[model samples]
Target: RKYFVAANWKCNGTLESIKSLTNSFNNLDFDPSKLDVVVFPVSVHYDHTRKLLQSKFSTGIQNVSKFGNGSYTGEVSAEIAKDLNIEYVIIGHFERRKYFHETDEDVREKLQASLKNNLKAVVCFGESLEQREQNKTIEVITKQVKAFVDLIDNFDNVILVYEPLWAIGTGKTATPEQAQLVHKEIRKIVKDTCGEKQANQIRILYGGSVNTENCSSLIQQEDIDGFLVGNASLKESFVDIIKSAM
Candidate 1:
């Protein structure tokens, strides 16, 4: 599998911002054979962003509704997203779980919806600060991850990202060793339930305070396949992050 580097703009980006960044993206050089890049812009900007890139890289939406072509007001369903030619959808983000009050059931429904529509899912799982301090990181992660694993029959189209809740947007990063430990455990959970072959094929990403300075070390870890960058992803230095993965 190729190293995957995804950018989650997360309510950020305007027409000018997209134009500037994409101009850089066009000039920024990297071996496509070695890396697979994806960007998740805000829902409103999704189509334009896709048009701007013209399939140079992958594009995704930050959220999706469980229903398909339904009467639900103010919701974007998987069917509509697929129609727009969007290939990926991010689900179970910590912010959605916290701010939007999305439950495990909600995440499961969204994942099912995405797959049913033939869209790939970037499924997120992580432990809270308190959970880590209490030595319950593995326990919390296992429970959250199992929710989706139990629901989905196939793991081929899934990309799992581990974003420690406390580290996100706080500029606090999990040390490479710490991140690797958690990532290994996550793969282990899959190995135990889904078997080794399926576990090995499923890409698990580490996302939390990723930047050019620390990105190389994080990517060096055995189980840390790639990154789901946050703040740094919108900057010119994001190219460094992508290069480091290569």
Candidate 2:
């Protein structure tokens, strides 16, 4: 798996800040062919961000509606993302499941919808702090990954992001070894659900307070193909994470 570093900007970024941020990233020093890189801006900033970005980097939406084109008020459909030339869509984020009460079934439908639009998905899976404390990391992570088993099409279009709720936005990060264990299991579960070929080809990333200080060591671990950066992605340090992927 080639290094696949993506910046999920979340619901952050003002127009002025986005312009400067994109400008900072636009001049990054690295070989684009060496790995894949993408950024997700809020829907309102999508059109503006896309234009400023260099072709070396790509853009994606943070989420997509489980329902397709219809009268779903305030929902962004997969088709709309496709039409806007967005290359990726994030699904199953912790906040969505925590605050919005998103279910695995909702994840399945949204995954299917994005697939229909030929949009690659950054499907997130993780365990909560309590789950980890209970030593249920594998059980929770694997179950979440398995939730999308049937929706996976050859596995190339789906990238799995493991972002522990305990770590995200909490200034806590999993040790490289801890993340390595989960990343390996994530691949194993995919192998069990999909096939050996699909499992081997898939890329799994670690997300949760990933920053320049820890990114280098995290990327060095086996099975850690890349990262789904959070707070650090909101600043220029995000470039450090990108270079480390190289």
Candidate 3:
């Protein structure tokens, strides 16, 4: 299987900011054949960035609406995303649920919406530091996985992103060994829920402070598929990260 590398730009960047960074990245050379790369930009820059990087790589919406069409104050529609040729949509992101008050039902709805639109869903799941300290890491992750998995009849278009909430932007990343153990446990949970072949084929990427320095070691782990990079993705650090994987 090819590696999966994704850039989670988060809630940052203006139009000018995106253009400048993308203009540079669009010019720099890299071997795209080795991995499936996805760049997720802030919503405002979605069309602009998509237009600029279309042929180079696939683009994803950081968040999409749970309902197909509604008066929900601030949410992007999944149908429009598909119409725009946006191949993927991220749902249940820790930040979105934690700070923004999105419920599990909301995540399930978004997943359904993505499936309805024929767009791939990258669903994020992980335990908080408090949960881990309380020895509930596995339980927490298992429940989260089940919450999403049980709702869907088809798992073919979904990618799971394991982003421990505590490690998100905190510089303190889980050691490769720690991450591997959790990943292995997750694979087991997936196997039990979705069967062996489906579980094995499902791509699970690790997020949370994944940068140039530790990305290589993390990628080397048998269970770690790739990275969902944050800060490093904004600077030249992403280059070293890509090299590390190579």
Candidate 4:
């Protein structure tokens, strides 16, 4: 796959707002042929958002049902996402875990569900500032990564996003070197756990405050594959970020 640039529009947008946003996106001088651009709108806007961007970019769900079918109520399943032609699904977003109390086990089940639906899971794992303060950053992320990888039979179909929990939406971002340290370490863990072939194919993206200004160096890093952009994605600045990767 060409490098995937995903916009996680977390709880941000109404129909009119998204319509206006798509207008700007549709008119941009962007080459979708070279980059796999995607946006993750909230669930209510899925169908319209999917249809709006159908011809150009891809669409994905921010979260999916851990339990399929029945009266789980308000939970969106991978099957529904698949019906919408959503080829990607994000697992274990920090907001979901923080506000909804999604555990690593829950993420494991969701990962299984996504694979069952033939959707690529962009699994996120990260350390908090306190974890970094205590010098346990690698240990914290490694455990989370291992928790999910240990449950799966293969990692070939999965993409990992390295998002620092503390940096998310906080304005403070992880420096390029700091982000690369985690990315390189995660690559090592993936190779060690799933072998060389899967590790080579699996993309590891950097998240948390990724914008046009910091994108170029980060994308050029040896281990950094792409980005899971936040604020920068809501505007044309994403075009600048995408070009950096190319």
Per-candidate Cα lDDT values, in order, are 0.85, 0.87, 0.81, 0.81
Show model 2 residue runs off by greater than 4 Å.
168-172
Quote the lDDT for 80 in model 3: 83
- Of 1 and 3, the candidate ahead on lDDT is 1
Which digits, one per residue and each the tens of the lDDT, describe model 2 over residues 1-246?
A: 788999988889898998999899987877777889999999898888988888899789988999999899999999988887789999999889988999898999999999999999999878887788898988987778778777887576888888868665566767889889888898888888878888899888887678888899998989888988888988976888899988
Lowest-lDDT window of 10 residues in candidate 4?
150-159
Clashing pairs in 2: none
Q: For residues 33-136, could you state the per-residue lDDT of candidate 1 as single tens digits?
A: 66788889999998778878745578999999977786999999999988888889999988898999998889999999998889999999798877887989
User: How close is each model in CA RMSD to the real structure?
Assistant: 1.6, 1.5, 2.0, 2.0
Write one digit per residue (lDDT tens) for candidate 4, span 1-246. Answer: 357678888878888878877776776556777777778888888887877764667778888889887788788888887776787888998878888899899999999988888888888879987788898987998899988886555554577999887675566778899889898899889889878777777788997678877888888888888889988888865777877766
Q: Given candidate 3, what's the lDDT at residue 201?
A: 82
Residue 210 alpha-carbon offset, candidate 2, angstroms = 0.7
Measured on C-alpha atoms, candidate 4 has an lDDT of 0.81
Greater lDDT among 3 and 4 belongs to 4
Compare candidates 1 and 4 on TM-score and give the better one.
Answer: 1
Name the best candidate (by lDDT): 2
Report the poorest 10 consecutive residues by lDDT, candidate 1: 165-174
Ranking by TM-score: 2, 1, 4, 3
Model 4 residue-pair collision total: 0
